[PDB]
Amino acid sequence: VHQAISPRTLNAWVKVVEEKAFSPEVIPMFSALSEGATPQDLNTMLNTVGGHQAAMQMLKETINEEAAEWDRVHPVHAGPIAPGQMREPRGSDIAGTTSTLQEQIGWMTNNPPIPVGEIYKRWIILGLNKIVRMYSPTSILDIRQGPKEPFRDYVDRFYKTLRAEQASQEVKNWMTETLLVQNANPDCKTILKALGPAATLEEMMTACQGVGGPGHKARVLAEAMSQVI
Amino acid sequence: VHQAISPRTLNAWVKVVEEKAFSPEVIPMFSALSEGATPQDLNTMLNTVGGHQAAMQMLKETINEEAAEWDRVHPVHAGPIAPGQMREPRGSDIAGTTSTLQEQIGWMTNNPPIPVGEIYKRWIILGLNKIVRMYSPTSILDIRQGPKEPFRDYVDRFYKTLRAEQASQEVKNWMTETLLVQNANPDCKTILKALGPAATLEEMMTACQGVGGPGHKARVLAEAMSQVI
Amino acid sequence: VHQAISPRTLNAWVKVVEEKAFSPEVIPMFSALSEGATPQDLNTMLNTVGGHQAAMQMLKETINEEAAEWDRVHPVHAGPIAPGQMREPRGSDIAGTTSTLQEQIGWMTNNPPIPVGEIYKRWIILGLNKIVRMYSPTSILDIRQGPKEPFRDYVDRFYKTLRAEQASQEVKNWMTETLLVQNANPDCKTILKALGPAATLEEMMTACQGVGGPGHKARVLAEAMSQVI
Amino acid sequence: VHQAISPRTLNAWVKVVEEKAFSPEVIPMFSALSEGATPQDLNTMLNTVGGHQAAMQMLKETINEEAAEWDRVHPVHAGPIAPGQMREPRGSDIAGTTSTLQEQIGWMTNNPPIPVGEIYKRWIILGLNKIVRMYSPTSILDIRQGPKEPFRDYVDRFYKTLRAEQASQEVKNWMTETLLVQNANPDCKTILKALGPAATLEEMMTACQGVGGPGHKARVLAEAMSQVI
């Protein structure tokens, strides 16, 4: 077909999902970056998304449900296929799983043509709509230690989201240098500030190990009552 | 047709038209959800827009104007229509007013195919383009009583806007109780605050109907003169 | 025809109507950019004028009345058309509404030739003459709030003019930051100045909501009599 | 063709470029305005972009590289062309440079059809995408004079940007009145404010011809030391 994706379109789509993540702007750009492409190019563009595993899982669920709807609307004709004709597509074929490049190209160049690529394109674009409406990406700045949460658990969440985040290694080191102490519970923040800027992660952790325990609660209560008295 | 509308796309279009009102980002979504849809499906999508009657009227005017332009571009050809072929569309025929689903299907799957859905799509896209460019939905946040506006007239305008506003009943009552008094000029706001928080609407109107009259002007003039005397 | 508009001429016309607006200097440029062009190209240039809707409505009225005058001068001959010959153009055909590219080209290359493009050019250029003489574009700097006008109405007028005005978005933001406060009458101007430079639009509108009311009039009268006393 | 652009699509596209400049908002609208339009109409739409010549150059570079890719994937046909069929398109033909309207219509209506318009639309979409990512239009608000920039060079840059600006003439004069003195560096701004608002441009340049010379530096240094002593 003459409407296959060029290398520039693939790189543009990759950059689009990189900078714009899954903002609404990803919907029109995709809507123009895969017009007339056979479904395998659409699958290639769907595969080029790095990260956002949950979002693409919702996308896959949407595509599967719409393939089921497609199969519901068009019943499968239980009859022998004429040598001149070829089998009608099913929802999986529109998705591209059970259909090869040759079958898709033949479908889009039939008389009358079946616009398999465009149908899969609509399914994908409304899955993208669902992603934009519901999915919210996890950001390191959204990771703040709770009021009664242990510092080990907060550090585990911080590092899990940092690894899941898409960023450079150097900027990730800067993030774990700054936000780890920045977005911390006030009780742990007092200990972290008292430790000093040269304290390592292990030292900070054994310092906040005692927070929330009976000894720390007794100490802070004693400080409060000394301020009162 | 293989690109017929499906419940998921219709629900998604409804959700984007209610959630996003007529923000510019409604142009991509529509342009991605009606791709390949028959004009009947376009009309079905257009009917589900609740509220925004003014914008809907602008959109209908744009459709009619573009259909007139289409009819002027494509002149009517006389003579008997060939039985193998079928009669050519007009502007209203594209619009679906005088064309049934069978006629639209025949147009979209003929040789050569007349893409009635795509021309419809362009006309509708122009309609929403004008809607977003010019039309601004009336919001209860903007209903504020003018300096000389009677309190009764302001209450009537506020209630009309509330009736036209799309929102749940509970949040509508909350918006009433929190914005009818707040969004008033100081001349009425002072009286309303002096009235007390536990004031019914009838008491509100009765107390504030005296503003702007000779008595209220004389009282406020005397109060102002008290400071200078 | 050899005298169709090149892309550079179209861009030059767009720039002319952009920077020069509808100043008289637009008349000579249109007098030269479109010379010998068939009416289709003339309409194409007449379509790239963003904004100035009222001006082009006057221009359309001029063209329609000149088509009527042209029909008045040359009566329509009620007779069969010779197969070698072709129908003479009516008033609308010179404007290109009832005539396509082929008929316009044939008219412009007849024996004797009918200079349809030049006749339409004369009609259009007199339309621009009327636009230059009478039409005055709405400018933001012409938006000044009246002595006894509510601030909400002034804001509505200011923002309507801002939306209708052509400019960059950053320029529009700077203009609504400066001129909105700058172009208010003494009462609203002193209220805005007392509010402060960081006050939001809602705060300014709330403060000016009371201007012109009985309370504000009593307060300013009290201030004046205190200055007297 | 059935999907030829009507006047209102062209005018709406012109307005889109005028107001939205090259924000991402231009990508969907364009893709929704040229749906099914022949690449001749695509060139017609692209020509009406007033200003932003750098962005148009980037777009033309995109179209050239996409045409190169199209010629790369599609090999040049060899041997005599079948009289029933006609010559295969090339990248320049998709871009509309070499192909005429008749050839493009023949491609669109061929069996099987070659979607020249959609391919060219995707190429222009890629160009617009890189424009919105990278290209940043020059704005008068961003013209600020460097600490060591001579006032003459600052004025030259300011006026060049103002001439390149899309805004109207009267608002351009207003911009000259306010921003030119507002955006000067403190050394020039002190002199300009000492001159008074009545000073003309020539007087202002005369008074800021000396900022950076031995006399001015000596004078400011002496003033600072005298304030110290």
Next chain:
Amino acid sequence: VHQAISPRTLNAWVKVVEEKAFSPEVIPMFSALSEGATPQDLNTMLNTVGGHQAAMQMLKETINEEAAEWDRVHPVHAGPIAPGQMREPRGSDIAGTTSTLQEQIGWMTNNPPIPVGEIYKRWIILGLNKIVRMYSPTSILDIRQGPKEPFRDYVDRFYKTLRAEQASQEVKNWMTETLLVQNANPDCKTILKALGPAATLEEMMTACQGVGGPGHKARVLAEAMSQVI
């Protein structure tokens, strides 16, 4: 081909480029994910590198020089090609520019086989090796303002690097919030910290417009001498 890449390999390679950027870990992964892959699949994997334009340019230069070497060592076949066999590959064909998928499949299935995919993989390996040794990605952490650099140029470079950065929008906003003032030179940093955290970018640029001018140098020199005296 049997060893055609699967969606998981493409996604894994994309993620490898996203996280590891261009580190020594890229060479092993690329050497194992694209094992036995058709050079068309190699090109698909190469197109997915979002950003790193300079590195990709270096890689393509390496591929071009390797193709030149391949054409140098392998002479061009002369005379007619045997119908049973097929034409020999060239350097561009190994690079995948001129070869089609069918040609590469025939090369790999030929007896004896021509391992086009492995040769292309080695060429890309050389390119990646040069990238990891020499190319260094631009990071906002490494953007700092020179001692004599005006704040406007620093801000422009900072924002250009930020736009080129691979990160999410909220993280980029956080970078703008902190690193823009953190990495300024002390002369600008003193003014920026005296401004306060509430200062906007425009206010910061206005305050720092004067550093390096005669007034600012005189003021700092006077302050230093007064501290001496």
